Amino acid sequence: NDKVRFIKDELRLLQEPGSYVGEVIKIVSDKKVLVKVQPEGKYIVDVAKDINVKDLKASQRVCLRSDSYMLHKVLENKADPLVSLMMVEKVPDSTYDMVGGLTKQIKEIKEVIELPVKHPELFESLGIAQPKGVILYGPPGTGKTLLARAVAHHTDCKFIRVSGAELVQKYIGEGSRMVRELFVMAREHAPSIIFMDEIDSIGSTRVEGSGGGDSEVQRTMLELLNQLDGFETSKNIKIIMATNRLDILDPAL
């Protein structure tokens, strides 16, 4: 008796066409919220009756109906490409003794990475403040990659490989500004090690040139690390870069 109800009930749910997904930008004084419907433009559209405007906050991703666009339920988990990337990459199982030798580098790297996350206060007291990041370079085949992943196990953070330009992403909007948007997403999804691999061998002509919109998008990201200082003060976002050579890298770094 109970089983047949469930089968029927599912069918009745599916009927509803569309159904969408926005993000509350702000709350307004007539008891409506300005939603950015994520593929579409902006719309100003009321809250559901059930939830009051006090419950909602700035930048809350929400679900939406499609027959009136009135809000449905708040999303339990933020919709962002970054989340999916973590899933795939998986929790680091690599450890220091996977790679033997190169002993100097192994000891050293614990100091640079492990401590600003775990004890930001201790790393500051003995030393001063915190890094702006770490750039890894050396012979390919050193297993620099294997070192970054090994530390990441012991640190116990979300090791999200973002390899390459995010012009590859084209899921919603242009991929250009998704580069820039990385800061925002890393903050929400902390603790995070952003492992920015990108050799910057997309053209030597624009490494040495003034030309290059790839260079511009790259640049706007670097500035966010020092304007917003979200990552610096409460360190839990390490900005780990890796390039094959120190000398083919963009000179704003």
């Binding site: 307004v28 007539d30 300005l34 100003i44 003995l126 250009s176 030309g211």
Partner: protein, 385 residues
């Protein structure tokens, strides 16, 4: 000390009282709507209803019609229907449309956008003046051009010469250019708008000039004013894709800024400060030379400059007071204040390796040698013949 306490006691009788007053006053006996509201309300709903499509207002034609663009691609010759008067509207504003029939049912949005958020800064900057140590003379050049005419145009009138307008800050990383601009503005206590250039350029078509025009409008209203456009050098002659494009949208945004610079209204009472590497990164076009007037070439710190800048840094490193301020200056090689930042960081870096429990006189001295060594190593010996 004592005075702080006073302020806390006053707050704990102020906020508690306030909360209770609100409840009684707004509603209960008095009533929150008191009849008049109820009337406006019934009318408003009719004219409205959800959803409501936010809009962008292109031009007003006095005849109760307007030309609007919505999210959707075609434009609309729409009627204004009641609410906001034509006067109280500003073209270039984001406006409220009723979705079924697109008519201007009001305004409340007022360029609801992150750009507006970043640009506005009504208070004066965090930097107070010549806290910064050295390049005194340099900073007392930027004050002659900017500050001095806003505080007193009298002197300029009496000479028979237009006040200078504009300065262009140019040169080199490490001299804390950006900082000097904030410093001069604070003294003036000019409403000091600030914006990043990267925001004004984007892939999407025609949004760029809207934003750019707006900067100029906001500034003129709130004159006396300073507009600090940071990372104008960003835009340059970067051209997304060298097959084609970057010669359409980018070009259009540059144009707008300049067309409003002198403007249809006289904004000589809007100074501009452009922080940039060089004007040769940009396609040169900065219009009216005497309208950007004096240009400021940053020299790097010299010997006397870096004493003062040093003094701040060494106070952070624990017990480095032991090593006389002067003799620290002497023993190292002449370097820029930036390289002091590198050196100060080197002291703490060495203290971390050592597990030096408290920073010492021995650390600060060791720090000099490793920092100086880094810079020489990095240099390439091509051999002076």
């Amino acid at each position: 000390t004592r005075c702080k306490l006073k302020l806390l006691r006053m707050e704990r009788i102020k906020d508690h009282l306030l909360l209770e007053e609100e409840f009684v006053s707004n509603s209960e006996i008095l009533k929150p709507f008191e009849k008049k509201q109820e009337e406006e309300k019934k009318q408003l709903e009719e004219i409205r209803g959800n959803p409501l499509s936010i809009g962008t207002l292109e031009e007003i034609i006095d005849d109760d019609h307007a030309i609007v663009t919505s999210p959707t691609m075609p434009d609309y010759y729409v009627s204004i229907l009641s609410f906001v008067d034509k006067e109280l509207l500003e073209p270039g504003c984001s406006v409220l449309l009723h979705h079924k029939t697109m008519s201007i049912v009001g305004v409340l949005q007022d360029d609801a956008d992150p750009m507006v958020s970043v640009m506005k800064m009504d208070k004066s900057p965090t930097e107070s003046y010549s806290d910064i140590g050295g390049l005194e003379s340099q900073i007392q050049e930027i004050k002659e051009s900017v500050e001095l005419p806003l505080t007193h145009p009298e002197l300029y009138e009496e000479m028979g010469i237009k006040p200078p307008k504009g300065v262009i800050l140019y040169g080199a990383p490490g001299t804390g250019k950006t900082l000097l601009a904030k410093a001069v503005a604070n003294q003036t206590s000019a409403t000091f708008l600030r914006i990043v250039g990267s925001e004004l350029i984007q892939k999407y078509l025609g949004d760029g000039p809207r934003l750019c025009r707006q900067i100029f409008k906001v500034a003129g209203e709130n004159a006396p004013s300073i507009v600090f456009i940071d990372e104008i050098d960003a835009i340059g002659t970067k051209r997304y894709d060298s097959n084609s494009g970057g010669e359409r949208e980018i070009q259009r945004t540059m144009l707008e800024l300049l067309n409003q610079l002198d403007g249809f209204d006289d904004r000589g009472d809007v100074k501009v400060i452009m922080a940039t590497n060089k004007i040769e990164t940009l396609d040169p076009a900065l219009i009216r030379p005497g309208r950007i007037d004096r240009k400021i070439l940053f020299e790097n710190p010299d010997l006397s400059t870096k004493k003062k800048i040093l003094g701040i840094h060494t106070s952070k490193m624990n017990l480095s007071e032991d090593v006389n301020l002067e003799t620290l200056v002497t023993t190292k090689d002449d370097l820029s204040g930036a390289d002091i930042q590198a050196m100060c960081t080197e002291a703490g870096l060495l203290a971390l390796r050592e597990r030096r429990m408290q920073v010492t006189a021995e650390d600060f001295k060791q720090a000099k040698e490793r920092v100086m060594k880094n810079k020489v190593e990095e240099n390439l010996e091509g051999l002076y013949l």
